[PDB]
């Protein structure tokens, strides 16, 4: 795969870290330059990193359930920061509790996320989607 | 304040209290005089410390779930359901993650959004925002002892509110509620702030109010070697006892090999009592809590019961005083009250199917206990050496030098050098030792156990095995065997 | 025919075969020469005896459900679901109760009523009515070995049909498929008819066709003391070996105390091998099967998983070759394929969470094994004495005199005098000995263990405790404590 | 005097016996004369015992699920044998599989049974119902 840069982080007041280490490992192995801002990351940290590194995509991980709050407004802040059209992915355990997945997916797509991932998504699925979205399959 | 493992004076503690209570307006509801009277009116059946004494005397394992939502009435209805339909022996109130980061402004917004949505947008109960009045309403609505369960580096105000609210146990400690739960908090600062929480319980005990404290054994819930987990728990018990705490539940998170897990819990209890008495704390009542599998769960609910109930069998045969209940929703999200009651019912059924049964002693168990005690002693010995006898200072320097090192901890004060992996029977071992201060004999034993897995699987032991072990249980088995 | 523990001659057996095949028109589908060639073309992966050897070699416990419905297509769909969605390692076909009483007229009516109703009104698969043709269709539609599981005093025609049908294991024996399953069948007649079933397997083995036989350990499923259960199983293994059987799985039903259950299964396997070799049967491959709790189940499905998975943990640590899976519908009715797959998935998850783990030896385990072996030897020694060296005659006389006595057996040839009950740790003991030929030392140990329960509960040991124990698990616990 | 007599048994090709022993024990302790015909009992055995002992009730236990077949026609045979209005109870696990209980209860009432009992019914419920129906409570 041709080299591209992503920002990777866990949003909000969320301290879950193991999935972040695995995602970094997997996307690096797939050929991406992973800019990993780590856990407990406000939206601004994702945007600062994407600007500094000219990132092609921002992968927001959210495990603790309060991402439904934390994730609102990221697209708008990205637009205002000059990142129009950047890919925004969100995945993990992104709402509080088991819910009807089509409802969750629409709720986050309506927030401006390009792709929205359910619990237990293998990193390989996001890698394949990213290659397709960046046209580097 | 300077960090020293020494009981705070009454004056130093009072000075800190007056600062802490100003951190949110609900701090005004805390009146220590009035709270002591309120606490002493709680029936013994609803006092967490006294019920732990009862469990220990009767030789039974008590089951306790995790539970919490944004709104008060919904939270009470949830706990009543776990009590009545689930049959819980103890009740939690699990604190939301904004409270854990002291962001009570975000708690308040989450409360309002939860009211609008008709469902909890918070992942727990915002106890500081609900204040003493809200926390008392929870206690008065239930018939079981209540414990704050959370993960908060700076829990000082939370502790004031929940204890004045009649909750007679607080979980946590300066290591176990920092390293798994924070990225930027110094070990010195979390140890100082947990001295406050311990010293508050010390004040209550001095008035004759009995309140339990529970260090968070499982840490990151991800392949934590028993000797490192136990070193933390023993340390937090010793640091709590110095501030006056008298009723302590030390904890351990299941690794999955039954003999290793039973060895771990027995070593934890034995060495906790041994160290407390060696340092002059002769009136501490110690109990144990076994956490059902804290790693990734299988999403299939029948497989989830496989994990819940095998874990409960290990706890029962270990003689644990308490077992923390997982639910079939673990892989997906915060459990419904029904999924939680399902987990409690399966757990208590397993406990009652094993009434009075204990794992008898064996050569295998004796050998594993000797390994765990010797590894734990290496770590604690070095901590006391680094601290020149002061275990609190020794803990700070142990983290600075990688002597104490927690797998996958987000804290930037964690070295992140030690690497765990399972051996051929599934026991968690040390793959890379980093700066953990083991003797050559102790390192050799880990290596010999791990070589048996390399031989059986036909691959060298490696970080790829660690990844395999991180995913194994969610994929249906204990050991991450090659696909 | 006269009963003797002597291999039937080829001529005697053939004479009986030609009578048996006339008992229903599907007997005409049985062609022994053709069936041998059919059986030899079954791949090893679908041969029950050969897969048992593989499990023993790999030290793994295989999971097997129970399953059966009236109609062929529906039964195949059911087994495929348990295979694919459940992950079963072995497949059953559970025979309906009309077939078990040789009432093939009632099977046929039940087939017609099941077609009309769109659901099975039979409680199993009518294998005699479906014939060799139908049993082969089942085998050819699945990817796992198939075993007839049932409860049939006169199973001669059934065995001919299912073995010619490619099913490479038959469960049962002349005691274990009589006393729990019949009222009016003499022990002599069921032993004679099960000699036929064993002699048919003996014929197949002489042609080089490997077929497993499984005596039914759990018997009445109701507080059966290990030594009485094990005496039956060893007897049925010996009687089968004399007729030429070479691959035998001896079984045991969970009593619930983990150490007693592990002791029971280990004693069963060790003494089965010891007795086989003592009597000159030197080429018999012995495996074990552990049955999850065969007594009354709790109705709550979460509590049911508590029983299923604790049972599986005992089986895994005992080193069982096979475990039979209960479902969360046990208290209510024949499980749906979904409830059955749920039980299998929880069972296999538990097995995989315990991979390679075994209960280590302890003084407690060593003591219980010595008790069980000594009790079992008392019973077998007396049987051989009564038979003047012939175990089959000794079994008849043992039932006539109460030396062998199965709790709650409906057979009028069962004395019904021995009475079991649990001790204070939940171990099943002898409350009333009847004519079971124990020494005073053995009786006194039972009494001493039971006195501990009297002391703890504050009531005399009694039949009321027996009733309490019969209901206890369905009411949420192992031991029938006073309310 | 007025000691009441019941016939107790397990119907059809069913060999389950533990519940029969418990029911015999419980109803005997409650003061009934229990005529226990045991397991594997065809309908005709219940009727022959009811005639010979002038029974006030027949308690049919059915555990193995095929009672939905076996139990049909008992009331009619009881009428034809001169046992009009004898009490007929049926309980145990009387159909194959978990089913909607009100539907099961009606199906067996439609066969002529006076009372119909779900899985797990305590003997004490049947004792209380029988004392009420016989006006001996
Ligand atoms: C281990 C664990 C812990 C450890 C974490 C240690 C640490 N610092 O990392 C401890 C015990 C400390 C912990 C704490 C808590 N936890 Co926790 N935790 C887990 C657990 C059991 C496994 C997580 C894990 O590490 N899995 C292994 C890694 C490899 O997988 P992963 O994290 O799922 O990430 C993978 C996939 O999700 C996917 N993925 C993730 N993000 C993304 C993004 C994209 C774009 C893509 C393509 C893929 C992708 O790929 C990742 C790599 O394989 C899960 C439940 C489970 N899964 O069984 C609960 C869970 C995540 N925890 C949960 C909660 C609520 C908590 C707390 C927030 C409690 C609270 N009320 O505050 C706290 C944390 C406090 C805080 N400030 O956030 C909930 C979330 C609830 C919800 N969403 O409804 C869960 C789901 C449990 C539950 N069912 O209730 N936890
Ligand atoms: C132990 C047991 C066995 C033992 C029985 C030994 C024996 N001979 O007694 C063994 C292992 C041999 C056995 C065999 C089989 N069993 Co079985 N057995 C059970 C089990 C686990 C418990 C039964 C028991 O003894 N309970 C304790 C006694 C005290 O309670 P009880 O029998 O339920 O009876 C009480 C209540 O029902 C009530 N009651 C009962 N009848 C009546 C009547 C009246 C009028 C009233 C008021 C009350 C009442 O009061 C009783 C006393 O408290 C049950 C499942 C469960 N309950 O968890 C399955 C169960 C009854 N078995 C079942 C089956 C199908 C079989 C077989 C028929 C298999 C087959 N396909 O042929 C065979 C029997 C062969 C034959 N010819 O009938 C099924 C029935 C399925 C259905 N109805 O849909 C059950 C429900 C399991 C299941 N979920 O599939 N079994
Ligand atoms: C990895 C967090 C662990 O704690 C549990 N937990 C955290 N918050 C809650 C909560 N609010 N309700 C019920 N369980 C909870 C969660 O299910 C998981 O087992
Ligand atoms: C006490 C009979 C035992 O065997 C099981 N059993 C008997 N017949 C079937 C059957 N036809 N399908 C599934 N399980 C069955 C039943 O669930 C119970 O566990």
GROMACS .gro file of C-alpha atoms in nm, chain A residues 12-18 21-22 25 37-41 64-70 72 93 95-99 107 119-120 123, chain B residues 96-98 101 103 106 109-110 113 119-123 180-183 222 299 301 329 331-334 408 410 463-464 467 470-471:
model
   66
   12UNK     CA    1  -1.299   1.277   2.560
   13UNK     CA    2  -1.258   1.159   2.919
   14UNK     CA    3  -1.200   0.799   2.797
   15UNK     CA    4  -0.887   0.623   2.928
   16UNK     CA    5  -0.917   0.288   2.746
   17UNK     CA    6  -0.575   0.222   2.592
   18UNK     CA    7  -0.532  -0.140   2.476
   21UNK     CA    8  -0.212   0.018   2.093
   22UNK     CA    9  -0.353  -0.258   1.871
   25UNK     CA   10   0.016  -0.163   1.549
   37UNK     CA   11  -0.235   1.117   2.021
   38UNK     CA   12  -0.340   0.856   2.277
   39UNK     CA   13  -0.620   0.852   2.533
   40UNK     CA   14  -0.814   1.132   2.704
   41UNK     CA   15  -0.798   1.344   2.387
   64UNK     CA   16  -1.646   0.433   2.715
   65UNK     CA   17  -1.991   0.517   2.573
   66UNK     CA   18  -1.991   0.895   2.623
   67UNK     CA   19  -1.859   0.945   2.269
   68UNK     CA   20  -2.215   1.016   2.159
   69UNK     CA   21  -2.164   1.343   2.352
   70UNK     CA   22  -1.792   1.392   2.285
   72UNK     CA   23  -2.064   1.603   1.822
   93UNK     CA   24  -1.822   0.105   2.178
   95UNK     CA   25  -2.284   0.469   2.257
   96UNK     CA   26  -2.397   0.377   2.609
   97UNK     CA   27  -2.534   0.022   2.598
   98UNK     CA   28  -2.648  -0.226   2.337
   99UNK     CA   29  -2.860  -0.040   2.082
  107UNK     CA   30  -2.680   0.922   1.441
  119UNK     CA   31  -1.840  -0.309   1.885
  120UNK     CA   32  -1.573  -0.566   1.805
  123UNK     CA   33  -0.881  -0.332   1.260
  233UNK     CA   34  -1.945   0.813   3.538
  234UNK     CA   35  -1.617   0.898   3.365
  235UNK     CA   36  -1.667   1.277   3.364
  238UNK     CA   37  -1.190   1.341   3.559
  240UNK     CA   38  -1.548   1.755   3.501
  243UNK     CA   39  -1.985   1.779   3.170
  246UNK     CA   40  -2.476   1.858   3.066
  247UNK     CA   41  -2.494   1.479   3.054
  250UNK     CA   42  -2.915   1.534   2.785
  256UNK     CA   43  -3.184   0.707   2.851
  257UNK     CA   44  -2.847   0.754   3.015
  258UNK     CA   45  -2.589   0.933   2.803
  259UNK     CA   46  -2.349   0.901   3.097
  260UNK     CA   47  -2.171   0.572   3.164
  317UNK     CA   48  -0.517   0.241   3.447
  318UNK     CA   49  -0.729   0.557   3.453
  319UNK     CA   50  -0.511   0.859   3.371
  320UNK     CA   51  -0.236   0.980   3.143
  359UNK     CA   52  -0.508  -0.704   3.059
  436UNK     CA   53  -2.000  -1.118   2.225
  438UNK     CA   54  -2.418  -1.431   2.539
  466UNK     CA   55  -2.346  -0.745   2.756
  468UNK     CA   56  -1.852  -0.703   2.487
  469UNK     CA   57  -2.117  -0.451   2.372
  470UNK     CA   58  -2.207  -0.183   2.625
  471UNK     CA   59  -2.333  -0.085   2.969
  545UNK     CA   60  -0.077  -0.131   2.901
  547UNK     CA   61  -0.204   0.481   2.981
  600UNK     CA   62   0.464  -1.001   2.121
  601UNK     CA   63   0.247  -1.171   1.859
  604UNK     CA   64  -0.171  -0.990   2.091
  607UNK     CA   65  -0.538  -1.015   2.432
  608UNK     CA   66  -0.801  -1.134   2.181
   0.00000   0.00000   0.00000
